[PDB]
């Protein structure tokens, strides 16, 4: 075996060149998403200025949108992605090309998966290209507090720069919080809030900021249904959320009261992993329809959960759950460690052990 | 080395030289049980074998062992660790030899595809002058602050 040429030749060597603005934006200033997709699938990078242009042009579109989007059916609704870029590619195959498919994403694009910045760049480029047919909500991970604790900040500094991270953080502040879909569904990442009684209470929030540690914006991003949702002995609508350490659990009575007061059919949300990629919760007694639905679009989450992912395609008065399996992705050592940092401790250990035993 | 150290190394050399040829073969090293389980033994022997004839003579043996003296410097220990990876002894860690040496160490804890991917990414991120290989300087820029040289000391 050669000491210079590559051993495992079936693995393509990633490109070192960083795409330029002329390579990424066509003759009309539109992103060339097919170029971008092929390059990012090879772990290719962009020139810093081009990455910043995608992030800031995307932010500009988001910044002009309402806290609560109004989205007509038909639409494909997607839950958590968490940096699993190669599964995002499968997602678009299953749900349909954005060229002819309306999309709503419920947040959590980053952290846990090691291709978070590729997720952001590609989704932001699609938002630029499809400003009125592809929609992005904020999840609880689209903030400074979580991305500096999890790996997105480090990912940015390894692949790009802290300047690109900082741009993402300002972009994330522009993300809308909720969608009213087909005048039937309230769509959010987390769920309901003690301080949100009507849709107008969402319209009144100031969203252009880091999510606070408490309050309605926080709850929209962070809240969960009770563990015993629909089976309540818990008589309180809202209880402290001990899993999250902030915000609340909401109960089935709480949800059904909100739906009836606001003339809604269901709440669509994400935020909790599901073995099948989705969960349908207890029907409201007044509607006959699930009061709550969780959609989770990250298959084989963290490379260990072995779950399916799903999206929800809502079309022609059918709610079509489409499941999908995980896809191969390139390997990274934990925390983006290089192979010298990884192996040198063991090298020092074992060469010293040999010498000790040689000399006895 | 001290006088008493030079005397102890001669005695030990003779005990390892099973066939009394005046040089240590790979088989002779591998006769030690603790070395049969150590995946870097051939790499260390190859580094000691500065004249490339396949065996370690006494001069090679003393020079080799002196790299691990408490009197050695950081650069000297880090240079030895570099040479573990630098199979072909040109002064640069290249893709093929970096994979092969890591594969020696990890065995089947990684698949060949996963290992080749993380080797590629380290070559790309650590190569600063574009020649596609890792110089000793590029190597030290990455690991010099881990203080592994402190652990590479033996009492003679």
């Amino acid at each position: 075996l050669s000491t210079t040429d590559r051993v495992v030749k079936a693995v393509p060597f990633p490109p070192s060149h960083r795409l330029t603005a002329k390579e990424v934006f066509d003759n009309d200033g539109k992103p060339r998403v097919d170029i971008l997709k092929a390059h990012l699938m090879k772990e290719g990078r962009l020139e810093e200025s081009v990455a910043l242009r995608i992030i800031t042009e995307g932010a500009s579109i988001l910044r002009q949108e309402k806290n609560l989007l109004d989205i007509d059916a038909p639409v494909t609704v997607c839950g958590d992605i968490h940096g699993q870029f190669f599964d995002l590619m499968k997602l678009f195959e299953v749900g349909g090309s954005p060229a002819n498919t309306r999309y709503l994403f419920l947040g959590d694009y980053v952290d846990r998966g090691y291709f978070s910045i590729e997720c952001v760049l590609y989704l932001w480029a699609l938002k630029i290209l499809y400003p009125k047919t592809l929609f992005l909500l904020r999840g609880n991970h689209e903030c400074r507090h979580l991305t500096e604790y999890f790996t997105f900040k480090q990912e940015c500094k390894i692949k790009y720069s802290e300047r690109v991270y900082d741009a993402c953080m300002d972009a994330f502040d522009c993300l809308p919080l909720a969608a009213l879909m087909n005048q039937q569904f309230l769509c959010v990442h987390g769920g309901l809030s003690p301080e949100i009684n009507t849709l107008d209470d969402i319209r009144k929030l100031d969203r252009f900021k880091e999510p606070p540690a408490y309050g309605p914006m926080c709850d929209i991003l962070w809240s969960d249904p009770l563990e015993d949702f629909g089976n309540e002995k818990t008589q309180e609508h809202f209880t402290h959320n001990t899993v999250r350490g902030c915000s609340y659990f909401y109960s089935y009575p709480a949800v059904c009261e909100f739906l009836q007061h606001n003339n809604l059919l269901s709440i669509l949300r994400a935020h909790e992993a599901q073995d099948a990629g989705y969960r349908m919760y207890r029907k409201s007694q007044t509607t006959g329809f699930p009061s709550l639905i969780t959609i989770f679009s990250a298959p084989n989450y963290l490379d260990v959960y072995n779950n399916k992912a799903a999206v929800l395609k809502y079309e022609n008065n059918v709610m079509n759950i489409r499941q999908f399996n995980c896809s191969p992705h390139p390997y990274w050592l934990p925390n983006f460690m290089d192979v010298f940092t990884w192996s040198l401790p063991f090298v020092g250990e074992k060469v010293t052990e040999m010498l000790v035993n040689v000399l006895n | 080395m001290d006088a008493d150290e030079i005397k102890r190394l001669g005695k030990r050399f003779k005990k390892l030289d099973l066939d009394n040829s005046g040089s240590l073969s790979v088989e002779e090293f591998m006769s030690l049980p603790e070395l049969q389980q150590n995946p870097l033994v051939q790499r260390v022997i190859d580094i000691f074998d500065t004249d490339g004839n396949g065996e370690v003579d006494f001069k090679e043996f003393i020079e080799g062992v002196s790299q691990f003296s408490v009197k050695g410097d950081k650069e000297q220990k880090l240079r030895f660790a570099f040479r573990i990876y630098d199979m072909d002894k040109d002064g640069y860690i290249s893709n093929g030899e970096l994979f092969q040496v890591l594969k020696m160490m990890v065995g089947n804890n990684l698949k060949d595809t996963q290992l080749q991917q993380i080797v590629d990414k380290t070559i790309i991120n650590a190569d600063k002058d574009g020649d596609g290989r890792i110089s000793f300087e590029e190597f030290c820029a990455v690991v010099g602050g881990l203080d592994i040289h402190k652990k590479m000391v033996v009492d003679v």
Binding site: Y314, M319, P334, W342, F346 | M105, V106, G107, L110
Partner: peptide, 19 residues
């Protein structure tokens, strides 16, 4: 430690399982 290791009216609901 012999080998290096990796560190530590109403809509109908339908299902299309994974391909």
């Amino acid at each position: 430690n012999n080998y290096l290791t990796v560190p530590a009216d109403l809509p109908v609901i339908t299902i299309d399982p994974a391909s």
